[PDB]
Design an enzyme around this catalytic site. Structure first.
Site, mmCIF file in Angstrom:
data_model
loop_
_atom_site.group_PDB
_atom_site.id
_atom_site.type_symbol
_atom_site.label_atom_id
_atom_site.label_comp_id
_atom_site.label_asym_id
_atom_site.label_seq_id
_atom_site.Cartn_x
_atom_site.Cartn_y
_atom_site.Cartn_z
ATOM 1 N N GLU A 41 5.742 13.089 -11.326
ATOM 2 C CA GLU A 41 5.611 11.440 -11.224
ATOM 3 C C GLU A 41 6.433 10.807 -12.418
ATOM 4 O O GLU A 41 7.270 9.629 -11.947
ATOM 5 C CB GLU A 41 4.120 10.932 -11.158
ATOM 6 N N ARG A 52 -1.395 -1.267 1.199
ATOM 7 C CA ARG A 52 -0.278 -0.176 0.923
ATOM 8 C C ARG A 52 0.402 -0.094 2.532
ATOM 9 O O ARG A 52 1.599 0.047 2.426
ATOM 10 C CB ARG A 52 -0.935 0.974 0.919
ATOM 11 N N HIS A 98 -3.693 1.767 -5.752
ATOM 12 C CA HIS A 98 -4.986 2.097 -6.541
ATOM 13 C C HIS A 98 -6.153 2.669 -5.830
ATOM 14 O O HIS A 98 -6.464 1.890 -4.654
ATOM 15 C CB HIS A 98 -5.256 0.654 -7.226
#
Lengths: 299, 311, 303, 300
Positions: free
Chosen positions: A54, A6, A105
Site C-alpha cells: 500500500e 464505495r 473506512h
C-alpha cells in the site's frame, strides 16, 4: 436503501474516465471483483492493478501525478492512517502533488482507523471530503478530479440512505443547509447526515427546531455557513463517525471560538454493525441527547 | 537564560538512572557527544546506542517496555511525524505500551527548503493518537519534573524538547502532574494559555499589556494531553476571553485543544497564536521568522482581537 | 517425528536455561505464540510485538549490538521479500550476530522457492537446513555459539526421524548416513529421508548409493563432496528448493573446480504454485522415485 | 577506448523511441544531465522523470507494463540489490511483468553490489544480460524491448574497449566465439570479455590456444555453446566482475556438471571489502592466465 459510497465511487470513475482522459485508477487488491470492476473493463489502459504494498501504491500515485495523470488511489483508511501515512505526508502533501486518495473506512482496534480524518486534516494542502450518500460521492469524485492538489475522500462499504438529489454540485469549502430551524444547528458528515435529519424530526416532536447542515467538505470547512448558523441558532451539535478529537467537532469549535463563540457539543467516538454504532453512541438519539446538552450551555 | 530543555532532559535521566533501576535510554545517534553523554558514562549497561533506523529504535523501545524496562527513546520530532509514525501509532499507542518518547524539535527555521523536515504539526499528530500523553516543558526545571513524572506514569508519553537555551520560568522544586496546568500571573481581562517557548513570551506579553491597561492571566499548559479542563473553564469564567500561544501549527495543537474544551463547557473567544503557514507566509522574509519566531507582540495583537470578540 | 518448527521451539527453552544472552523475537500475535514454551519459560527475553517483519529484523539487529543473541522467528517468504534488504544491508554486510529462524511453507510468491539461494549469496550469512527434530536442536544450539548471521530453515509438518538425539552439528560438516560405491546422493531438509528411501530402492536393483546429509549448506562440506566424488564418481543432489542457486549449484561449484563429475540436480524447476503435500512433491518432482531417476541419469553420464 | 555502456544505452533508447511508440523511460535522477539527455529531448511525453524513491520508480515501471507500455527503468545495481529488490521480486518477477531494468553498476561495501547478477539470476522469469561494450549494449537494449518478460541489463559509467562490430545482433541464450583455440575455453562477460581476449594473446605466446567466448546472455545461458566448448577444449575458465558465487562461474558449473563435466575455474570477486582495484580483486588478464594454467592441470 441507497448504494454504498464505495459503490457510487466505482460508478463515478467510469463516467470520469469517459469525460476525462487523464484520470487513472490505482488499486492493490487482486481479487476477481477488482479485476472485473467496471473501470477495469472500460479503461484497462488506465487501470493500474498490481500486487504491491500500500505505501508503494501511494508512491506510484505520487509519481504518476507528476507526469500529467490524475491518479485516484483506492485504499483503506487503516493504511492511510498507518503504513502509508509517511508517504502521504512527506511525498504527497508537503510537495502538494495532485493525488486523490479514495479511502474505504471499515465502520484489533488499530485495524479501525477512528482518527483518519484528524490525521489528514492536520497535513498541509490536503483537502478532506466525506460524502453522505451515492449522489454526493459522485459530485465529490468529479470535483476532486478538477481541483489541483491532494484530496482524501472517505468511503464506506455498506448502503446508506439517500440524502441528496442526483444533480447536486459539490464545492470545497461549502456546506449545505438541509433543514431550517432556529433553536440549534446540527452539523454532520458521512453516515451521520441522515441521522441528523432523523434527530431533527425527533426534536420537532419535542418543540425544538433544528437547522441541519451537511459538511462533507471537512477541509476546507465552510466558515461562513458555520458563523451564520451560530448567529441564527446560538448552539451547535457536531456529529461524525470519527474520534471527537481532531475531526468535525474540533474543526467547528476552532472556527466558532475565533469568530462567534457558542456551544459546540460533539457526537463522535469518545474512546477506542448497529450494536457497535449503539455502544460508541452514533445514533439519532445520541444526537438528540447532544442537542439537549447544547441548549443548556447557551448564555 | 536557562539551559535547553534537551540539556535538562539529559541531566534528569542521570538522576532517574540513580533512583530507578528499570530506566533504559535509547539513542540512534552515534556521534562522540552522544557516546560520552552523562547517562552513557554513568549507566552504560542501560544505554542502548544502536545505529539502526529510527523506526527500528522505536521498535526496540516497544519491545523493552514489554519485558519490564521503562524506555526513554531520544529522537527527533521529524522522525516521530514521519518514518517512526506508524510504529508509534500501531505498536506503541493502540497496544498502550509504556514507552517515553523524548523528541527534540528544531527551531522555526526551514532546513534546506524541506518544510517537511520541520515537523510543525508533531504535537497535533501525537495528540490525536489514542493513549498518547503529550507534554511540552517550558524550561529546565519543568523538563526535569516532566521527565521524572513520565517515568512513573503508565503508558505512552511524548515529550517535546528544544536545542536552544530558554528563559527560566519555574523554580527548581516544581512538581508536574498530567492534566494540571499552572497560573503564572493573575489578571481579569483575558487569559493567555501557552506552552514550551511561548510561556516566557506570554509573560512578556502580559507586561506589555499591563502598560496599556489590560490585565492578563497567564497559564502554562505543558500538559497538552490530557489538558487541564478545570483550569481552562475557571479561566474562561473569570476572564471571558483566551489567547493560546504555541510554537506549533495553529491546527490540532494547544489552540484546538482549548477551543474543543471551552466550546463544550463555557464558550468564549479563543484566539490562536501559532504557525499559520507551514511554508512561511509568502510575504515576510525567512530571516524575520528566524530572528523573531512568534513574538510577545503577536500575543499582544491576539489579545486585542480576543477582547473585541467578547459578547 | 515432530516438525522442525516444533523442535526449534523446544530447543530455545534449553538454550534459555543454559545461555542468559539468548532472546527470541516473534511478530505473530496468536495465542499459540503468546503461550509457547519459550514465552512461558523466559517472558523477560521474549519480544512479541505486532510490528512489520522488516522492523522485527531491524530490532534483532539492534539487540545483537547490545549484548543479546537474538533468534528472530519469521517466514521464508518475508526473508526473501520484504525483510531481504534489511537482512542484506543491516545484518550481513555489517556481520551482526542475528539468527533467523525462517519457517518455510511446504500463491506462487507466497512460496519462497529461492530462499536458500538468496541467503547463500549474501556475505557472512551461514545457511543451515535441518532434516529432523534432533538435527534442528543441534543446529539451534550451535547457531547460538557461533558469532555472525545464521539462517535456519524450518518447516510446519512432521518429518521422519533421521538422526539420533545425541547428534552434534558442525558448520562445514555433512554426514555419511549410508555407504555405497556407485553414486552419492547429497540431500538436505525433507529430502534427506527421501534419499535414504531412494537408496533402499536402488539397492534392490543392484546400485549401492552413498547418502550424505548436508544440512550445512553454507559453508558447505567441500572435503566430503570431493571425497564422495573420488569414491563414487557421480552425484545426485536433492533439495526442496529451486535447482538454481541451492544445493545442486553449491555442489557443482565445488566439484567443477576440484574433481569434476556428473552432478544431477533434483529440485524445483519451475515456479507454478500448485496449491496436498504429496501431490505437490509429485508435480514438482521431489519424491524418492525422482531421486532414483536422477541416479539412473547420473550413472549414464560417468566418463 | 569505446564509450560507456550507460552512454550506449541512452543512444539506443532514442532509436527505440523512433521505432517503437510503446517504449517509456523512467529515471529518478533529477540532475540537469538527465533532464536534457537525448531521450528526454526527443520523447518528453514518454520520459517519466520523477523524484521518488527507487522502489517507487520500479513500482511505476511495473504498473506501466500492465497497461501496454514497455518501460525501461534506469537505476543502479545497489538499488536493485537493496531497496528495490522486494518490488522487483514480488511485483515484477513472480507476476512476470514486462519491465526492463537498466542498472548502472559502480565499478560502505554494501554500496557496491558485487552480487547483483546472482540476486537477479535466482529470481523466476528474470533474464540477465551483461553487455561487453557499446555495440553489444545497443543490440541488447533493442532485443530487450522486443522480448516479453522482465530483463536486467547491467551497465557501466566508464569507457570500455570495443569488442564487437556495430551491427552485432544479440539473442538471449546465445553467446559468441570471439577466438578459436583447442586447449581451454575462457567464458567471460561485461568488462572481462576484453580482458579474456588479452589473456588469450598472452597464452598464445606460451603455446596455449584458448577459445574465448562472450556470454553477455547470463540468463538464459547458452548451454549448447558451453557443452560444445567443453567437448572441444576439455577445460573452462570463467571471468566476471562479480562475486564468484552465484554469477557466471556458477551458471557454467551448473550446466557442465549435468551435461559434460570438466574443470570450471572461476575468476571473480572472492572477498568483499569496499576499497589497483582490478589488481586487488584479481580481475586482470594475468589473473585469467593464472586461472587457465590451473584449469589445464585439472584435466583428467
Amino acid at each position: 436503501g441507497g448504494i454504498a459510497t464505495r459503490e457510487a465511487y466505482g460508478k463515478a470513475l467510469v463516467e470520469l474516465g469517459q469525460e476525462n482522459p487523464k484520470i487513472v485508477v490505482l488499486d492493490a487488491d487482486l481479487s476477481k471483483s477488482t479485476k472485473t470492476s467496471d473501470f477495469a473493463k472500460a479503461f484497462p489502459e488506465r487501470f493500474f492493478n498490481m500486487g504491491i504494498a500500500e505505501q508503494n501504491l501511494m508512491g506510484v500515485a505520487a509519481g504518476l501525478s507528476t507526469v500529467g495523470k490524475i491518479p485516484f488511489a483506492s485504499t483503506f483508511a487503516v493504511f492511510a492512517a498507518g503504513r502509508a501515512f509517511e508517504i502521504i505526508r512527506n511525498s504527497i502533501c508537503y510537495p502538494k502533488l495532485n493525488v486523490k486518495i479514495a479511502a474505504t473506512h471499515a465502520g484489533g482496534a488499530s485495524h479501525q482507523a477512528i482518527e483518519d480524518l484528524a490525521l489528514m486534516r492536520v497535513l498541509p494542502n490536503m483537502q478532506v471530503f466525506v460524502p453522505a450518500d451515492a449522489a454526493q460521492t459522485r459530485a465529490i469524485v468529479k470535483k476532486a478530479a478538477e481541483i489541483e492538489g491532494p484530496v482524501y475522500i472517505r468511503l464506506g462499504r455498506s448502503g446508506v440512505p439517500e440524502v441528496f438529489s442526483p444533480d447536486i454540485r459539490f464545492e470545497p469549502g461549502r456546506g449545505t443547509v438541509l433543514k431550517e430551524g432556529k433553536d440549534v444547528t446540527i452539523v454532520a458528515l458521512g453516515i451521520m447526515t441522515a441521522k441528523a435529519l432523523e434527530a431533527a424530526k425527533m426534536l420537532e416532536a419535542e418543540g425544538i427546531a433544528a437547522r441541519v447542515v451537511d459538511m462533507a467538505s471537512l477541509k476546507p470547512i465552510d466558515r461562513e455557513l458555520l458563523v451564520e448558523s451560530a448567529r441564527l441558532t446560538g448552539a451547535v451539535v457536531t456529529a461524525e463517525e470519527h474520534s471527537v478529537i481532531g475531526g468535525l467537532g474540533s474543526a467547528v469549535a476552532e472556527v466558532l471560538s475565533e469568530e462567534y463563540p457558542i456551544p459546540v457539543v460533539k457526537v463522535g467516538v469518545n474512546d477506542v454493525p448497529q450494536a457497535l454504532l449503539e455502544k460508541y453512541g452514533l445514533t439519532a438519539r445520541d444526537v438528540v441527547a447532544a442537542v439537549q446538552k447544547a441548549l443548556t450551555l447557551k448564555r
